Amino acid sequence: SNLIKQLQERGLVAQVTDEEALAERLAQGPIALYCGFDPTADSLHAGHLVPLLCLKRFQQAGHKPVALVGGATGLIGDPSFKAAERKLNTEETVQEWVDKIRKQVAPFLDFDCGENSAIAANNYDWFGNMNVLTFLRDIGKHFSVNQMINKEAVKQRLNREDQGISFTEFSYNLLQGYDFACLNKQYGVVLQIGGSDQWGNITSGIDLTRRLHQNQVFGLTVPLITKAGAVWLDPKKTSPYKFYQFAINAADADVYRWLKFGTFMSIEEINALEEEDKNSGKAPRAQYVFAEQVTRLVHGEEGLQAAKRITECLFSGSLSALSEADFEQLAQDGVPMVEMEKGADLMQALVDSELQPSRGQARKTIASNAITINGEKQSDPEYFFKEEDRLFGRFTLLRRGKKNYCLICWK
Ligand SMILES: N[C@@H](Cc1ccc(O)cc1)C(=O)O
């Protein structure tokens, strides 16, 4: 059980500072480590899973994860590797996002396992009331503009005026540096993990911790899954169905690394899967394993089963199993959707959903037996929907041909 050796085996270590010294330190016993997540939206996306779960593997190994939420950094904006200057967000909108993100972080870590039990942190606790002169004096002298401009993230923003960077976003690096120090002092954190794009910010904090506290602390970055639309963790931004679908459609190139980064599946099992797939008459079920594991992680069993149930209905044509909550996911993102007043005929439903272009055309297509209503074929061009077709009084699913869906949301 050399944690760093395993993480490397999983393809999880993008880079790491002073590796041998870190391996020894962990092997000596539990440490505290952190990773921080900024409130730049009301939810995390599938990308953040990598560092997040990585803290869970650290906690499974006896270590103590701190999950920092950027109450303060969210008011500022990480320019790291972004070509465009972010608009600032509202102080009231940011706190909204903070509590939300704190909340969705929490289920992935054990807050009640004794000593290595997890801790939520918010860097607003230290920046929220810090005087500007105090900041400039105690933290800002230890930073050199030269060294700052030369860091890889902000380097491209600085050549010359394709885009610029505000002094605000430039400041950002210092705040993440001080977070590290402040957490080293407060909780004895000695490792920070983060995505590969965060190296610079991590290293400034290592360096600053030397100068402030005379401790040695480590850096470790995990690789990105560049999915920022993004695949949101929030079921209301991205439905478990859609989430499951993203997963089950991971390319072959990616699926094995995503198995590694995104799931607690055994390294043994992940290899066995790969070696099987390559042999097995081109029978690749890794996506399917991938999908089920991560959906279950993120959305629980009930989310998994829903997404599978919704997947199975759109494949089969039979809607018998759908619940109302299942139509809501279809409505939110699962299939195209149209709102309609009750009393419209089929012909019209087909026009208003874009399945047919004219009433006259709809008529001929209905008559060629091309249209199903809730799975059951309907070929009477003059058909009016009846209450039975308004499932849960609200929902009707059209299909044209074998795979063109549109969901009718009745008002
Ligand atoms: N800079 C990180 C978030 C973060 C904020 C504060 C920290 O101390 C650490 C990390 C990001 O934008 O992804």
Domain count, the chain: 3
Return the structure tokens found at 273: 């899967």
What are the C-alpha distances in Å from 168 to residues 41, 54, 174, 186, 187?
A: 19, 30, 10, 26, 28
Q: Is 374's C-beta closer than 6 angstroms to any atom of ligand 1? A: no
Q: How far is CA 49 from CA 45, 265, 359, in A?
A: 7, 14, 48
* CA–CA gap between residue 316 and residue 307 (Å, rounded): 14
| Judgement on whether residues 19 and 161 belong to the same structural domain of the protein | yes
Method of determination used here: X-ray
- 193 alpha carbon – ligand 1 mean position (Å): 10
Give the span between the Cα atoms of 254 and 224, in whole angstroms. Answer: 12
**Whether residues 136 and 100 fall in one domain:** yes
User: CATH number of the domain that 257 lies in?
Assistant: 1.10.240.10
Select from 197, 227, 257 the last residue of a domain. Answer: 227
Residue nearest to atom 10 of ligand 1 (CA): 36
Looking at 227, 257, 280, the residue that finishes a domain is: 227
Asked if residue 70 has its Cβ within 6 Å of ligand 1, the reply is: yes
Whether residue 338 sits in one domain with residue 215:
no
Q: Check whether residue 240 and residue 372 sit in a common domain.
A: no
Q: Which atom of ligand 1 is nearest to the CA of 38?
A: 3
* Same domain as 1, residue 143: yes
Please tell me what resolution, in angstroms, this structure has.
2.7
By most ligand atoms within 8 Å of CB, the mutation choice from 38, 54, 119, 226 for ligand 1 is: 38
Q: How far is CA 257 from CA 15, 193, 244, 251, 253, in A?
A: 16, 19, 17, 11, 8
Q: What are phi and psi of 162, to 5 degrees?
A: -50, -50
Q: What dihedral do alpha carbons 317, 320, 324, 327 form, nearest 10°?
A: 0
Ligand 1 center to 38 CA (angstroms): 5
Instruction: Give the Å distance between the CA of 2 and the centre of ligand 1.
Output: 27
Q: Read off the DSSP letter of residue 384.
A: B
What's the number of CA atoms in the CB half-sphere (13 Å) around residue 36? 31
| HEC assignment per residue over 57-117 | HHHHCCCEEEEEECCCHHHCCCCCCCCCCCCCCCHHHHHHHHHHHHHHHHHHCCCCCHHHC
